[PDB]
Design a protein around this nucleic acid. Structure first.
Ligand SMILES: Nc1ncnc2c1ncn2[C@H]1C[C@H](O)[C@@H](COP(=O)(O)OP(=O)(O)OP(=O)(O)O)O1
Ligand SMILES: [Mg+2]
Ligand SMILES: [Mg+2]
Ligand SMILES: [Mn+2]
Length: 758
DNA sequence: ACTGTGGCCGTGGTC
DNA sequence: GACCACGGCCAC
């Protein structure tokens, strides 16, 4: 099984390394034969003789074109003749590419920014993570001596916990009488023992939770302070701390550093992403949190360090269990994209689509278009029309069927051959013409992306079958994440068409897909309501809720299924409308916001404050209870009583602060907020107190009693002292609870005055 | 920061 | 007060 590639430099020449696991043995394979290259398109071939003479000077050594070779390739399906320029070292390509491009005979250059080791994986047809090879894994975590406002890493590490399938242990340097603690003499000894555990266990995978940004950097700093070589690489190397935008990522040569946070952050939607909150969300069970003060208070007194050791051991054990659950999903994406698990687990979905396309283009001899320059970016700025959203019917409806197209946009792309290499391709036998926007797509030959999307859909359907048949609820949920992941990837091929920085950008493709989408769903709404007696209650892009007014549950189900058998034979290609759900009762508040209840009594909520991380829990809890009373008990006065009870508790300061916290992400550097709302105001004030705030920081705040700008009374949630400050009851009533529940209860004739406390 | 557009809603800046 | 950009997050 291939894990990763890189290259090293020996005597000026690049040597590729393939890291592999085979029959239980770790192997490094060296390849000295691979030559870096890019392509130049010339005004004509006589110019190759002058183009070959372009040089560049890098660090006092002359970079030259090693060898030029004329090749025939396709570009958007059309023959093209380009010159393949070979070089003696990968660094030669960035040193020379601008000067090759500036040559007056050179129309353009291509495939000049592809990292050498990834170029090798693609060109040699190598797919990481293929095979039945069983890989060993090891999680670890650290506990540090923290005091607020010191520079990063000034405090000693106190404990290092690690866990695999067989054990979970804590290494520390103070006496804790627990069976899973190993006490050693010093912090230096603790780290050195951790290093030996990893050398001796020799895991293929190292699992952390935010190791990219905290754990490895802390260890590195302590190793520097104590004079330790931080050997974890299988080749003796230290961890390599590469930059990724505003964050970092940490590589361990010969192993896969699997940092869970990026994967968790993009898979699960939570208001905060503590390890405790993630563990609870995945496994449905609590994890205790011991805080930095509690840690420091224990360390400096000697007392109650058992709890700290327990907390550390659980960190590692939970990190391991989370790692085991999610690794198969990342391994599969790794095989689908053809890049290392280390890369795919950290990559944006945009880069994944691009890397997939680059590989497939190589197999097809399709020259890749370039990422756009600033001028082309500028001319790509226009938007385009998206999906149709029907304003919902007001009120409480019974016997609601939910119908929804399977993999709609990908299905449109394949069925209508929507691709840049088919757009307005001239002199063709057959065309599909997009409605409204008019773009013509040739059907004579399969388009590049259309030809690739099917397998993705089949891969998703294969997972979905395994899911719906899987009994164990935890495995079923992880299979649900997995099938959603392949679904999001498939739809990201559509979105890639309208992505400004995309290589195979094609706005005409993007807007053709949405245009077909609007026509299909509006045709379904029309057929249902004009011919089959349904009332469509709500509709969003490719799905719809409908009922037959006055009909019993089984009549609606029967007519809905009859409609599916009437409509689907009339749909072209892969287009299929699916029966997705039936709800005995349901309520549509506005576009994007509704709630239904199935025959088993489960309420499904969309878009309502219940669902959002940025509303307080007292607002979301109360909304949930109101919805249950209405949807499950039919009882609206209970709902009203519920609200009136909660507003009475807020007034009397009888609601606990936890339910008052608002959570909002900082999404950008603090300095380029054009407007400063509460979470930004809090952030900036923490920033001024020397706290690192960066994109992805989740601000947690509570609004104190006062008047004026909310931002002037918002404080960090952890600073709310219920004795010294009092929360702003009026704010939580009139700005949190009542807006959330009034949007529901107004349907029943209730006004806010009906809901407040005396 | 990087797959797309449609959309609701709170906050606080401008008159 | 009206007006309405900004920002966050959600449904597709
Ligand atoms: N994350 C997304 N990125 C881009 N386009 C999206 C995204 N989610 C939804 N869309 C678009 C493409 C989908 O085909 C369309 C309808 O959404 P949806 O019903 O959730 O997905 P789907 O039809 O692809 O899958 P499914 O088989 O679950 O119904 O909206
Ligand atoms: Mg849908
Ligand atoms: Mg004025
Ligand atoms: Mn769908």
């Amino acid at each position: 099984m291939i894990l990763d590639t890189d290259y090293i430099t020996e005597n000026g020449k690049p040597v590729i390394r393939v890291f592999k696991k085979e029959n239980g043995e770790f192997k490094i394979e060296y390849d000295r034969t691979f030559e870096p290259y890019f392509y130049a398109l010339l005004k004509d071939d006589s110019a190759i003789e002058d183009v070959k003479k372009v040089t560049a000077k890098r660090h006092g050594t002359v970079v030259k074109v090693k060898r030029a070779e004329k090749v025939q390739k396709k570009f958007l399906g059309r023959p093209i003749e380009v010159w393949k320029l070979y070089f003696n070292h990968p660094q030669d390509v960035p040193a020379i590419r601008d000067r090759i491009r500036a040559h007056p005979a050179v129309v353009d250059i291509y495939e000049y920014d592809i990292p050498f080791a990834k170029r090798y994986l693609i060109d040699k047809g190598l797919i990481p993570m293929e095979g039945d090879e069983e890989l060993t894994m090891l999680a670890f975590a650290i506990a540090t001596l923290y005091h607020e406002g010191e520079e990063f890493g000034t405090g000693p590490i106190l404990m290092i916990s690690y866990a695999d399938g067989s054990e979970a242990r804590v290494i520390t340097w103070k006496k804790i009488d627990l069976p899973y603690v190993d006490v050693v003499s010093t912090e230096k000894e603790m780290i050195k023992r951790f290093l030996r555990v990893v050398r001796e266990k020799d895991p293929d995978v190292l699992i952390t939770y935010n190791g990219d940004n905290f754990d490895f950097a802390y260890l590195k700093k302590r190793c520097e302070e104590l004079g330790i070589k931080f050997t974890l690489g299988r080749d003796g190397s230290e961890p390599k701390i590469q930059r990724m935008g505003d964050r970092f990522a940490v590589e361990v040569k010969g192993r896969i550093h699997f940092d869970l946070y990026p994967v968790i952050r993009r898979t699960i939607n939570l208001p905060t992403y503590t390890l405790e909150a993630v563990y609870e969300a995945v496994f449905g069970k609590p994890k205790e949190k011991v805080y930095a003060e509690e840690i420091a208070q224990a360390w400096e007194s000697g007392e109650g360090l058992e709890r700290v050791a327990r907390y550390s051991m659980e960190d590692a054990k939970v990190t391991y269990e989370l790692g085991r659950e999610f690794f198969p999903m990342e391994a599969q994406l790794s095989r689908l994209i053809g890049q290392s698990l280390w890369d795919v687990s950290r990559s944006s979905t945009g880069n994944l689509v691009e890397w997939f396309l680059l590989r497939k283009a190589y197999k097809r001899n399709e020259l890749a278009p370039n990422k756009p320059d600033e001028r082309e970016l500028a001319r790509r700025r226009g938007g385009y029309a998206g999906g149709y959203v029907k304003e919902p019917e007001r009120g409480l409806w019974d016997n609601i069927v939910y119908l929804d197209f399977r993999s709609l946009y990908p299905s449109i792309i394949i069925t209508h051959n929507v691709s840049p290499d088919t757009l307005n391709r001239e002199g063709c036998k057959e065309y599909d013409v997009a409605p409204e926007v008019g773009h013509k797509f040739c059907k004579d030959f399969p388009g590049f992306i259309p030809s690739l999307l099917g397998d993705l859909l089949e891969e998703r359907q294969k997972i979905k079958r395994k899911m719906k048949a899987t009994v164990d609820p935890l495995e079923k949920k992880l299979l649900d994440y997995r099938q959603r992941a392949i679904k999001i990837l498939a739809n990201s091929f559509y979105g890639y068409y309208g992505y400004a920085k995309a290589r195979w950008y094609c706005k005409e493709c993007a807007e053709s897909v949405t245009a077909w989408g609007r026509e299909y769903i509006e045709m379904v709404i029309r057929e249902l309501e004009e011919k089959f007696g349904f009332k469509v209650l709500y509709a969003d892009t490719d799905g719809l809720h409908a009922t037959i007014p006055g009909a019993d549950a089984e009549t609606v189900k029967k007519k809905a299924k009859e409609f599916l058998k009437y409509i689907n034979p009339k749909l072209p290609g892969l287009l299929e409308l699916e029966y997705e759900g039936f709800y005995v009762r349901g309520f549509f508040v506005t576009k994007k916001k509704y709630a239904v209840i199935d025959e088993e009594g489960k309420i499904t909520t969309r878009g309502l404050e219940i669902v959002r991380r940025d509303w307080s829990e007292i607002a979301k809890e109360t909304q949930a209870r109101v919805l249950e009373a209405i949807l499950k008990h039919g009882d609206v006065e209970e709902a009203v009583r519920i609200v009136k009870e909660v507003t009475e508790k807020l007034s009397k300061y009888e609601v606990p602060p936890e339910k008052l916290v608002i959570h909002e992400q900082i999404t950008r550097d603090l300095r380029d907020y054009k407007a400063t709302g509460p979470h930004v105001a809090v952030a900036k004030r923490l920033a001024a107190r020397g706290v690192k705030i960066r994109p992805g920081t989740v601000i947690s705040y509570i609004v104190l009693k006062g008047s004026g700008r909310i931002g002037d009374r918002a404080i960090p949630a952890d600073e709310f002292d219920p004795t010294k400050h009092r929360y702003d009851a009026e704010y939580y009533i009139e700005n949190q609870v009542l807006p959330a529940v009034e949007r529901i209860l107004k349907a029943f004739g209730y006004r806010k005055e009906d809901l407040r406390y005396q």
